[PDB]
Write a protein that binds this ligand. Structure first.
Ligand SMILES: Cc1cn([C@H]2C[C@H](O)[C@@H](CO)O2)c(=O)[nH]c1=O
Ligand SMILES: Cc1cn([C@H]2C[C@H](O)[C@@H](CO)O2)c(=O)[nH]c1=O
Lengths: 436, 436
C-alpha cells in the first residue's frame, strides 16, 4: 500500500538508514501526485533534517524533483550553456552585468529569469526600465537569439520542478528549510531542470546571507558542487560576502544604471570584483579559457574595448528595447525626489544591515509583497558609503530616491540599519573559490 | 498568527529547546480544534522523537490531552479508586480476576473497559459470555454499585482525550509512535482522564510486548510513574514478561473460565503470580495495607475464604448476568470442536511466539479486525505446555477450540509459533517492581 510504503520509508530514514533511489522516486512521485499526504512528507523532511542524506540520496532527490516537471532542452543552442545561481542578497546586480559580459566573450547566455517578490524587482523587472523591452519570445526565437548573439532572456517556464515548489513551501511551514540535503537538492533541481550544461553558484555568507556563517556557506557550496558533478552538469562555486549590500544601488532602474557603469569599467569596486570572479568561472566552464586568470583577462578586455556594453545594447535591441537608453542612461525612469540621508556623527561606517536597507528600498516601491503588487522602477536607495569608509557628521550616507514626499518610515528603517564608529577594514568580498 | 506560532514551536523543539506549558497547550488545543494542520503536528512529533521532552513538558502534554475532553469525576465513590493499565499481551486475563479480587478486600474498582479490536475480545466481550450481563448502566448507577459492592464496569465514555485519539492515529502513520514522552503522555492521559485516583502500570517486556527490551520497558515505566506522581495520581509499575502468552487460555469464554479457576486458587501459576503482584500494589495504593506482603496476604485470604469468587458473582448478578454460571462454568459457551495439536518431536518447549498464537486464536473468531466484526465467544486456544515444560512427540501442546471443521490455516500459524528443543528454564515473570 501507498500508506505502508511511505511509513516504512519514514521509519527507515528516522532510524538513520539510507533510502534507495526507488524509495526516493516513490516519495517524490507520490507526493507530487497527491497520493502521499503533506503530513507524511513533513515527517520525512524532519527525519531528513536530523539524519541527513548521503550524496547518492541527494542526487536521487534532486533528479526525482527534476523529473517531476519540465526539462528544458537547450541542445540546439551551440556551446556550453553555463548558468549562475545566487542564494541572494541586497544589491546583487550581477546578472545584469554578467549576461552581456559573458556573451561578449562568446559564452552562450540562455537565461531564464523572473519578476517576483522581494526587496526589489527580479532581473526582468529591472530590464523593463528600458522602454519596449519584453520577454514575450517563443522557444525557436530564444534559441535563434542565443545562437546569433550569445544572449537572450525569457521568463520562468510554466511547470519547472513542481515537486520542489510543493516541498519547499511545505518545508517553510514545518521547520525543515535549513537542512543541507534539502537546500542543495532544491536549488540544484531548478538549475538542472532549466537546461544548464554547467552551473556557477554564488553562495552568500554573513548577516545578509541565507547561510550566515562561513562554515555553513562552505558546507552548502561543496554539497551543491558534488551534486552537479555527479549528474554531469559541471559545477563550481564562490563564497562571497553579504555583511552589507553589494555595490551602491538598491532598486530597479538604479541598478540598471550601475550595471551600465560596470559594463564600462566605471562601476563599484565590489560589484566589479564579484562579476569578474563569477564570470571567470563561467568562461572556464564554457571552455572559453583554460584558467581563471586567462578568463579574467578576456572579460576585462571585453569591458575595456566596449564589446561588453555593445552586447548589452544588442541584447536590449533584439528584445524590443530602446538601446539608445544604454548610451544615455540619464533618460532612464528618475524618481521625483532625491533626499539625502546624512550621518548623525563622524567616524567610519561599521555596520550596514543589508536586509533592512532592502526593506527600506522596498517600502519606497522598489519590490513586491504579492504577485499582484506593482513596482515603481524609479525608486530605491543609492549608498554613498560602505563598511570601512570615513564619514563626517552631516555628510551623505546615501540618497533616497522617492516618488512620494513622506519617507519618514523609510528613514526610520535606515536609522536602525547603519552604525558609525571607529575605523574598521572593508570586509573581504571573495572568501572562497570552490572547484570540488 | 496560528501558523507562525506553530512554526516557532516546531523550530524551538527541533533546536533542542524546552517548550513552555503555554506552547504545549496552544499546540494541543489548536490541533484538536482543526486550527493546526496534521502536517505541522507530525513535524513537531518527529522533532520530539529526536529531541525528547523533560518531565514538565511531558506533564503539560499529558494534561493538555486530558483537558481536550471528558474528565470523569469519581469523587462520589468512596475511597481511593486505583486503576491498572497493561501495555497488553496475549492471554493477559488479569483484569477479570483483579476486579472482583481487589473489590473483595474493600478497594473500589470503578472500571471503565471496552470491546474493541485485537486478537481476542475486550474485557466486556469476555464478560458477555455470561447470559444477561451488560454494561448499560447510567452514571448514578455505576457510583451506587461501586459504593455498595466495591465493583462495577462500564464501557468507554463518549469523548475521552480526543487530542490523544487524533495524535496517536497520526503518530501511527508518520513514524512517531515509539517515543517515550509521546507514549507516556498518551497512556497516562487516558488513565487520568478516566478518573483514577491512583494508577498501577503493567509494562510488558519481551518478544510479545510493545517494549521488547527490559531497558526500554523500564524507561517507559519510570517515565509514567514520574508523570502520575507529579500530577498527584500516585502511580506504581511492574515490568512483567511476555516472551510467551500469559496463562493457558487465549480467547473469550475460555479466559473467563481461567479467571474463575484463579479466583478459586486453581489457576495457572503465572497468571496467579501476576495477579497477586499487581493486586498487592493496588491494595497498598488504595490504603488498604501498609506493605506489599501484607496486601498479598489479604488477597490470598480473599481467594481462600471464597470471598473473591463470591464478589465476582455479586458483580455479575448486579449487572444482569446469571451468576450461577460462575459456580458451574461448564455451562459457559463451548466450541463444537476441540482439536488437539500435538508435539512433532520430544524435548522441551523453548519458544511460543505470543502474537502469532494470538493471531491463530483470532482466526478461529476470538477477536475483531473492524468495529463491525462479530466475535465468537466460545473459540480460542488453550495451551497445555509453556516455555520450559517437557513434551513428548505426540503429546498435546495445546487444544484448539473451533466452531468450524477446517482449522488448517490456524494449525499452520501455530506451526510457525512453537519451538521444541533441549531444556531451558521458565523465564522470570516479574522483572521489576517500581515505586519511583
Ligand atoms: C533555501 C532555499 C531557497 N530557495 C529559493 C526560494 C527562496 O525564497 C530564495 C532565497 O532563500 O531561494 C529554494 O527554492 N529552495 C531552498 O531550499
Ligand atoms: C504506544 C501506545 C499505545 N496505545 C494504545 C493503542 C494501542 O493499539 C495499544 C497497544 O500498544 O495501546 C496508545 O493509546 N498510545 C500509545 O502511545
Amino acid at each position: 500500500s501507498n500508506a505502508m510504503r511511505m511509513i516504512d520509508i519514514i521509519e527507515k530514514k528516522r532510524d538513520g538508514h539510507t533510502l534507495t533511489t526507488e524509495e526516493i522516486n516513490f516519495f517524490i512521485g507520490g507526493y507530487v501526485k497527491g497520493d502521499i499526504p503533506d503530513y507524511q512528507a513533513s515527517s520525512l523532511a524532519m527525519a531528513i533534517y536530523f539524519q541527513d542524506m548521503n550524496d547518492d540520496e541527494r542526487v536521487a532527490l534532486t533528479m526525482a524533483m527534476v523529473n517531476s516537471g519540465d526539462m528544458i532542452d537547450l541542445s540546439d543552442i551551440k556551446g556550453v550553456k553555463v548558468d549562475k545561481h545566487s542564494t541572494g542578497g541586497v544589491g546583487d546586480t550581477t546578472t545584469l552585468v554578467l549576461a552581456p559580459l559573458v556573451a561578449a566573450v562568446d559564452v552562450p547566455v540562455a537565461k531564464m529569469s523572473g519578476r517576483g517578490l522581494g526587496h526589489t524587482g527580479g532581473t526582468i523587472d529591472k530590464l523593463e526600465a528600458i522602454d519596449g523591452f519584453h520577454v514575450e519570445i517563443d522557444e525557436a526565437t530564444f534559441v535563434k537569439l542565443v545562437n546569433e548573439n550569445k544572449v537572450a532572456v525569457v521568463g520562468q517556464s510554466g511547470n519547472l520542478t513542481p515537486a520542489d515548489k510543493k516541498l519547499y513551501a511545505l518545508r517553510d511551514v514545518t521547520g525543515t528549510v535549513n537542512s543541507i540535503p534539502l537546500i542543495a537538492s532544491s536549488i540544484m533541481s531548478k538549475k538542472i531542470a532549466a537546461g544548464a550544461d554547467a552551473i556557477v553558484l554564488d553562495v552568500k555568507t554573513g548577516s545578509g546571507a541565507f547561510m550566515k556563517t562561513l562554515e555553513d556557506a562552505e558546507a552548502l557550496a561543496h554539497a551543491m558542487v558534488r551534486i552537479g558533478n555527479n549528474v554531469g552538469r559541471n559545477t563550481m562555486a564562490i563564497i562571497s560576502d553579504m555583511n552589507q549590500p553589494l555595490g551602491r544601488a538598491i532598486g530597479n532602474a538604479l541598478e540598471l544604471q550601475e550595471a551600465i557603469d560596470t559594463l564600462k569599467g566605471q562601476g563599484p569596486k565590489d560589484l566589479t570584483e564579484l562579476v569578474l570572479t563569477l564570470g571567470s568561472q563561467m568562461v572556464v566552464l564554457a571552455n572559453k579559457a583554460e584558467t581563471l586568470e586567462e578568463a579574467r583577462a578576456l572579460l576585462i578586455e571585453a569591458i575595456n574595448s566596449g564589446a561588453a556594453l555593445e552586447k548589452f545594447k544588442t541584447f536590449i535591441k533584439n528584445q524590443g528595447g530602446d538601446e539608445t537608453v544604454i548610451d544615455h542612461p540619464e533618460r532612464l525612469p528618475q524618481a521625483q525626489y532625491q533626499i539625502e540621508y546624512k550621518a548623525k556623527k563622524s567616524g567610519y561606517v561599521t555596520e550596514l544591515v543589508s536586509n533592512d536597507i532592502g526593506v527600506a528600498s522596498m517600502m519606497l516601491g522598489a519590490g513586491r509583497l504579492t504577485k499582484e503588487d506593482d513596482i515603481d522602477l524609479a525608486v530605491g536607495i543609492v549608498l554613498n558609503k560602505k563598511i570601512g569608509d570615513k564619514v563626517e557628521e552631516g555628510e551623505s550616507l546615501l540618497t533616497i530616491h522617492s516618488n512620494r514626499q513622506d519617507v519618514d518610515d523609510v528613514v526610520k528603517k535606515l536609522d536602525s540599519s547603519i552604525t558609525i564608529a571607529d575605523h574598521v577594514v572593508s570586509p573581504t568580498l571573495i572568501h572562497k573559490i570552490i572547484t570540488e
